[PDB]
Amino acid sequence: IAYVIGYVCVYNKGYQDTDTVLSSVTTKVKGIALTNTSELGERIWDVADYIIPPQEDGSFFVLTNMIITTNQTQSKCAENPTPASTCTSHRDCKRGFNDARGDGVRTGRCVSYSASVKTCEVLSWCPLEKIVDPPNPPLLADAENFTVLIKNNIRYPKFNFNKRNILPNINSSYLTHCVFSRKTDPDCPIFRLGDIVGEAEEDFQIMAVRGGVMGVQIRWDCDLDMPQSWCVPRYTFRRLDNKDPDNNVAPGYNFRFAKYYKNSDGTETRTLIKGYGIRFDVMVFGQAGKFNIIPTLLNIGAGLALLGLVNVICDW
Amino acid sequence: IAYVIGYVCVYNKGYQDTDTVLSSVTTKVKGIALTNTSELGERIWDVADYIIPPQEDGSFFVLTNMIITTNQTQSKCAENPTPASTCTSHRDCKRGFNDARGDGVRTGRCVSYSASVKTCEVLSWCPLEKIVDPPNPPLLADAENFTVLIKNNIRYPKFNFNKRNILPNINSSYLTHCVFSRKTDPDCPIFRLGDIVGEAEEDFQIMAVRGGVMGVQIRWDCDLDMPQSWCVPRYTFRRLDNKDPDNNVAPGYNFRFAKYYKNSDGTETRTLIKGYGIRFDVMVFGQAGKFNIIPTLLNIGAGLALLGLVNVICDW
Amino acid sequence: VIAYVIGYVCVYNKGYQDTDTVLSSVTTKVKGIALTNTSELGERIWDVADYIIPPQEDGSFFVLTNMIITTNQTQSKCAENPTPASTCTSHRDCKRGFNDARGDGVRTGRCVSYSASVKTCEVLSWCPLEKIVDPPNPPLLADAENFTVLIKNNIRYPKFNFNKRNILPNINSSYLTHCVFSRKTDPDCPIFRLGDIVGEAEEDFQIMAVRGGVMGVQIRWDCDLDMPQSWCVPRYTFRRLDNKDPDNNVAPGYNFRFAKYYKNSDGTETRTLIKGYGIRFDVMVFGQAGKFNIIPTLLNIGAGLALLGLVNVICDW
Ligand SMILES: CC(C)c1cc(Br)c(NC(=O)Nc2cccnc2)c(Br)c1
Ligand SMILES: CC(C)c1cc(Br)c(NC(=O)Nc2cccnc2)c(Br)c1
Ligand SMILES: CC(C)c1cc(Br)c(NC(=O)Nc2cccnc2)c(Br)c1
Ligand SMILES: *[C@@H]1O[C@H](CO)[C@@H](O)[C@H](O)[C@H]1NC(C)=O
Ligand SMILES: *[C@@H]1O[C@H](CO)[C@@H](O)[C@H](O)[C@H]1NC(C)=O
Ligand SMILES: *[C@@H]1O[C@H](CO)[C@@H](O)[C@H](O)[C@H]1NC(C)=O
Ligand SMILES: *[C@@H]1O[C@H](CO)[C@@H](O)[C@H](O)[C@H]1NC(C)=O
Ligand SMILES: *[C@@H]1O[C@H](CO)[C@@H](O)[C@H](O)[C@H]1NC(C)=O
Ligand SMILES: *[C@@H]1O[C@H](CO)[C@@H](O)[C@H](O)[C@H]1NC(C)=O
Ligand SMILES: *[C@@H]1O[C@H](CO)[C@@H](O)[C@H](O)[C@H]1NC(C)=O
Ligand SMILES: *[C@@H]1O[C@H](CO)[C@@H](O)[C@H](O)[C@H]1NC(C)=O
Ligand SMILES: *[C@@H]1O[C@H](CO)[C@@H](O)[C@H](O)[C@H]1NC(C)=O
């Protein structure tokens, strides 16, 4: 008798009708980066430069490192050295054979890539992207000091509940100059990228050399029987990409994009950037419960049946 | 006896095995806007101009107002007036100090922004974006008359159910020239942005002056025991961003993007646009139920146990 | 019925399971090269930076297959396309300032001769207009049939504190370097082929790519945590998501328009408008996991005993 109400009715939440969450997320990134490499000279980077695409709210990408190829035009051209594409004679290379290496469609003739070696001749954007390891340290290290503001609006449809992650006790003056600290400022929604990466027990620079995927998990576990002010979100940070170099393929997170230009004579030129960066995904989940009568009665009946069973067992 | 079957078996849906929904959404926007401001002259806007990014199906952004800065180049330059960045002497400004205001990295020297005042000297894209309130009325007011077509395809995996929001009774001739009216055309999926904003008890112009977030909620609550034709979606519209100027930070919804150009001599120029617009999010949710035997028997047993309990109570 | 309860309700109904949903992240990378040799454009190659718009939309990627290109478009006063609803009989026929829903532009009072035979209302917009021309057949990027896509899915069950990846630990990197997905031969390879994905839905790639369409990759994570961890594997299914009946749907296929902007020496702005038809792949991850519990088991046992009492009473009568 005491056991049923003690555990099944209370801790198991059998007296609760439950619902899931419907959420929307808005992210705004602020920060400025500087680069002083010899190849590019002296350059600054603002919010319109290191975020690709410009608006991907809910999952934003921050550029940290890049490889740039300029003055690329559609032309016949030479492949990079490779044992599987080395040219012994004109009959070695096959015309029209599309390769999976990403160079381009092959032609019958082959040309000398350098004095020492010759390779098959293909038509593509040239000059090709050199196979070079990304620079270390990363070009946009100062991305460690960027800030991100996250605004989350949740709704429980069955209970007709709407909530925001910005508590009503918080004034705008404090939000103007604010930062998230686990011990000092738990209600600030303005996180730091370096802090987010550190909370997962990782170093920002090593991750940003080759990129990676990070995930911000917001948990809305709210009991609507309790007062509304007890409904608060819980923030957790977790890496989402494999680090073992033996099991995964294509470590880190990188992708290629391009800029197109037209010259005076009308010819088209392309600048190809392969960017390595850290992609942050906002993952919102939760479940809410409210008191109900029918589930309570069914659980009480099942508990009484279990009491009858245990009484019968003890009788024997 | 009558109570159990009357309420617990029927209204509580205890005889139902339930499943969630798996949905895909496709949105297409049509409309044309005109602008006749003195700064830009006389310009037209089509679907390829006021949607950024071009394809974000499921959550589309419609530009309504903008601030444009042109001929921005990487150079040493002067900051905007600010009490926290006012220059008293060369020793006042600190070289290499990165600011959170978004201007750029500071240098030791400082220069006169105007005759009256002088500020610290920084290197960034210049000329800077002037701190100017967005124009009122909004530049793209005609965005009130745009139309959006929403196609939603849902599936319940456990029951192997597939459904579309376009009913089979609807012919293409009616869909060619169609609009959504709550009282007249409830099955048309072609909504009007002005109507969507009005259904939330708001004015379109005021919202579009500074932007905001809107949310279209589609509810698929379908009982598969009933015939298939009874499975229809329900559309609701709700604002998702705070309007109180005292609690939220960064009111409205705006973001910055850029266009890059290359001159004949090779120098790079940027045109920075800060755009204010209304972001519509499509939020699809639902739950379906079908008859089952085991849950029915368990509920009948629990009801009989409750009947035994109430009989015992009445005996005492 | 004592046997029946344990045989069916306790075991097959999974009444002894506390259940949780899945929280997933998806990463997609596309590799392939296309060639076009049309007379209008000449001889062009296409890489991963050309046929994917936008460049990063991980979880739902769009692959360009066919396109219509209009060049040298500038803001100017100009003439409309022929149309019975926009044909000009006289200057009083066209109304100035009347915005149309056809997508041409705002109308002006005057009207001009589109050709010698016919005249139409005069509007200000980007010109020359996009000609109303059927998309080329066969599609320009047919070689998109041979592209490959790598899908990496990371799932978590929060209540049970479970984290899993779709790349099994038994798989080595050497096999993943040169790998392809075959239902009968290589079920654990996550490197799919677009042609194979379309074929698994009983469709032809070329016909779909002529006008575009929407495809959906469904990954099912139905894992029983009571069983060992190695039994937790995903199941891949492929389904078309857009209607094919030309009588019920509107705007068949999947296409959208985008633009490129250029600035000339004198400062005037020019636009190149591309209407692209392509196949959009959506990754849809769903699942549910269960683990043993005591309270649900006891409640189900009690309900089964109550049902046993009911059936005994019924048999007595
Ligand atoms: C020329 C080179 C040094 C260079 C310049 C810039 Br600016 C950027 N950054 C961007 O283009 N960001 C961006 C924004 C919006 C859409 N697409 C991309 C890069 Br990666 C390389
Ligand atoms: C020069 C100024 C008057 C101007 C011109 C245009 Br055109 C636009 N619109 C866009 O660039 N839209 C858009 C589309 C695709 C990708 N990125 C942006 C803007 Br906001 C300002
Ligand atoms: C000039 C014409 C032949 C042409 C050239 C190209 Br290159 C492309 N392709 C793209 O522009 N892809 C793309 C990538 C990133 C952002 N926006 C678009 C197209 Br459709 C037409
Ligand atoms: C950038 O580097 C150059 C030489 O490498 C140096 O003269 C200059 O002071 C540097 N600027 C900054 C801001 O570090
Ligand atoms: C980030 O800011 C701190 C404090 O100003 C500074 O010490 C650190 O060097 C900055 N990070 C980088 C990469 O410069
Ligand atoms: C704003 O909120 C902070 C948070 O503690 C508080 O210290 C401060 O007094 C508040 N300001 C006003 C004017 O109430
Ligand atoms: C735009 O404004 C100019 C002057 O401000 C005027 O002459 C012209 O008729 C206007 N055009 C439209 C379409 O309103
Ligand atoms: C939208 O259309 C209506 C009817 O044609 C018109 O009265 C209204 O002015 C239009 N909106 C704007 C912003 O011009
Ligand atoms: C098309 O559907 C509309 C909707 O009511 C109907 O009025 C009309 O008769 C239908 N047309 C045909 C040809 O059936
Ligand atoms: C492209 O077409 C031209 C003529 O139409 C032909 O000369 C050339 O060989 C073709 N190239 C390829 C790679 O098919
Ligand atoms: C795809 O590859 C196969 C095998 O190499 C080839 O037969 C086929 O023609 C290719 N597809 C296209 C569209 O060329
Ligand atoms: C890599 O995995 C494949 C998969 O069967 C296997 O055949 C091969 O022997 C493995 N290589 C090594 C070095 O274990």
Author numbering:
A (entry chain A), B (entry chain B): 43 to 358
C (entry chain C): 42 to 358
Question: What is the paper's account of this structure, in its own sentences?
Answer:
P2X receptors are ATP-activated cation channels, and the P2X4 subtype plays important roles in the immune system and the central nervous system, particularly in neuropathic pain. Here, we report the cryo-EM structures of the zebrafish P2X4 receptor in complex with two P2X4 subtype-specific antagonists, BX430 and BAY-1797. Both antagonists bind to the same allosteric site located at the subunit interface at the top of the extracellular domain. The overall structures of the zebrafish P2X4 receptor in complex with BX430 and BAY-1797 are very similar and show a chalice-like trimeric architecture with each subunit containing a relatively large extracellular domain and two TM helices, resembling the shape of a dolphin, as in the previously reported P2X receptor structures.
BX430, or 1-(2,6-dibromo-4-isopropylphenyl)-3-(3-pyridyl)urea, is a phenylurea antagonist. BX430 inhibited ATP-dependent currents of both zebrafish P2X4 and human P2X4 (hP2X4) with comparable IC50 values at sub-micromolar levels, and the results were consistent with the previously reported IC50 value of 0.54 µM for hP2X4. In the BX430-bound structure, the dibromo-isopropylphenyl group of BX430 faces the outer side of the receptor, while the pyridine group faces the inner side. The binding site consists mainly of hydrophobic residues, including Trp87, Ile94, Met108, Ile110, Phe299, and Ile315 from one subunit and Tyr302 from the neighboring subunit. In addition, the main chain carbonyl group of Asp91 forms hydrogen bonds with the amines in the urea group of BX430. Interestingly, the side chain of Lys301 forms a cation-pi interaction with the aromatic ring of Tyr302 from the neighboring subunit, allowing hydrophobic interactions between the side chain of Lys301 and the 4-isopropylphenyl ring of BX430. Furthermore, there are intersubunit salt bridges between the side chains of Arg85 of one subunit and Glu310 of the neighboring subunit, and hydrogen bonds between the side chain of Tyr302 of one subunit and the main-chain carbonyl group of Ala90 and the side chain of Asp91 of the neighboring subunit. Further close inspection of the allosteric site revealed that in the apo state, the side chain of Lys301 faces the inside of the receptor, which would cause steric hindrance with the pyridine group of BX430 in the BX430-bound structure. It should be noted that the binding pocket is more expanded in the presence of BX430 than in the presence of BAY-1797, probably simply because the 4-isopropylphenyl ring of BX430, located in the outer region of the binding pocket, is bulkier than the phenyl ring of the phenylacetamide moiety of BAY-1797.
